[PDB]
A paper describes a structure:
As the most abundant viral protein encoded by the M gene segment, matrix protein 1 (M1) forms a shell underneath a host cell-derived lipid biolayer to connect the vRNPs with the viral envelope in mature virions. The full-length M1 protein includes 252 amino acids consisting of a highly organized N-terminal domain and a flexible but less ordered C-terminal domain that are linked by a protease-sensitive loop. So far, only the N-terminal domain of M1 has been structurally resolved at an atomic level, showing that at neutral pH the physiological monomers have a high tendency to oligomerize via a so-called ‘face-to-back’ arrangement, whereas at acidic pH the N-terminal domain exists as a dimeric structure in a so-called ‘face-to-face’ arrangement.
However, the G88E mutation causes M1 to be trapped in a face-to-face orientation regardless of pH that consequently resulted in inefficient virus growth and genetic instability. Surprisingly, M(NLS-88E)-neutral dimerizes in a face-to-face manner at neutral pH in contrast to a face-to-back monomer–monomer arrangement as possessed by wt-M11EA3 (pH 7.0) and M(NLS-88R)-neutral. A further look at M(NLS-88E)-neutral structure reveals that the G88E mutation results in three inter-subunit salt-bridge/hydrogen-bond interactions including Lys104-NZ to Glu88-OE1 (and its symmetry-related counterpart) and Arg134-NE to Glu88-OE2 that may explain why M(NLS-88E)-neutral that is predicted to crystallize as monomers in a face-to-back arrangement is actually driven to dimerize in a face-to-face manner at neutral pH. Interactions between the monomers that form the face-to-face dimer in M(NLS-88R)-acidic, M(NLS-88E)-acidic or M(NLS-88E)-neutral involve hydrophobic contacts (mainly between the symmetry-related helices H6, and between helices H9 and loops L9), as well as several hydrogen-bond and/or salt-bridge interactions. However, M(NLS-88E) M1 is trapped in a face-to-face-oriented conformation irrespective of environmental pH. In the case of M(NLS-88E)-neutral with misshapen face-to-face monomer–monomer interactions that seem unfavorable for M1 oligomerization, a thin, uneven and broken M1 layer still forms beneath the M(NLS-88E) viral envelope as exhibited in our TEM images. This could be due to the presence of the C terminus that may provide sufficient stabilization for a malformed M1 layer.
Author numbering:
A (entry chain B): 1 to 69, 75 to 161
B (entry chain A): -5 to 69, 75 to 158
Write the structure that this text describes.
């Protein structure tokens, strides 16, 4: 699907360049192509990768948890970060909005108004309330969060 | 550190919880469960939680509070508890719930914590519990108790 391939592109955009990036991709694709499952061994593999910042692991964990038909703590930790107020004050308002969105694009457009921090905080909390938004909308958020992070790594 | 709570505090907490449960034999059962779990009668959470989930009479909200408490004192996280506490997710209950959530991370006394929590509505508090429920390590156990009691007081007051 164009959508899944688009998401994966956004997701992949934050992983550092290397062989892992191509491995992480293959996984994302098998998961997308409807192949196997056992998110367990997947999250296990995912939580033991050397080079991936914790935030990258959280987002990947979120994505896999979202695409693979259980609330691992390393996913919750990395996403919530320092639970810095405001980040949490925004993610809550972003969250209340996303509950009303239905399209991947309506969702990504709004989520891109918020900072990387509040976004990760918004993902981290929807990770506990996964049925609060649709999969597409959730995707919109993920993508928006990867562009905000990619742009943060840019301002160097 | 250590996980010893004074039997006075536990009975304090126990009377607040019990304040929202309707009289009847069920309430007497809950008291038993709550007390011998306060004493630490080698209790199993999954059992308790399952029992708690399948109980009649009890409103969802009361099941969430009791569920929060048991998890708090006994050594997976349920769902009926999250829905119960979270419930409605009013975009304001959550606003306040997050602000309270951050203040309690710097609190250390059941009293100090229960003192602040009361400055909030039964709704925000319930959402705050819902938050800590997925982050029981954010605040200490006694502080968590303060929130529970302040929450039980607020609803027993709206009643």
């Amino acid at each position: 699907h164009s959508l899944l391939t688009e998401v994966e592109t956004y997701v992949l955009s934050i992983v550092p360049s290397g062989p892992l990036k191509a491995e992480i991709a293959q996984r994302l694709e098998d998961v997308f192509a409807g192949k196997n499952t056992d998110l367990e061994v997947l999250m296990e593999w995912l939580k033991t990768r050397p080079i991936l910042s914790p935030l990258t692991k959280g987002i990947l964990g979120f994505v896999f948890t979202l695409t693979v038909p259980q609330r691992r703590r390393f996913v919750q930790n990395a996403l919530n970060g320092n639970e810095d107020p405001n980040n949490m004050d925004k993610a809550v308002k972003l969250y209340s909005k996303l509950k009303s969105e239905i399209t991947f694009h309506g969702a990504k457009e709004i989520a891109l108004s918020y900072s990387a921090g509040a976004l990760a905080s918004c993902m981290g909390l929807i990770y506990n309330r996964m049925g609060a938004v649709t999969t597409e909308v959730a995707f919109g958020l993920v993508c928006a969060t990867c562009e905000q992070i990619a742009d943060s790594q840019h301002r160097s």
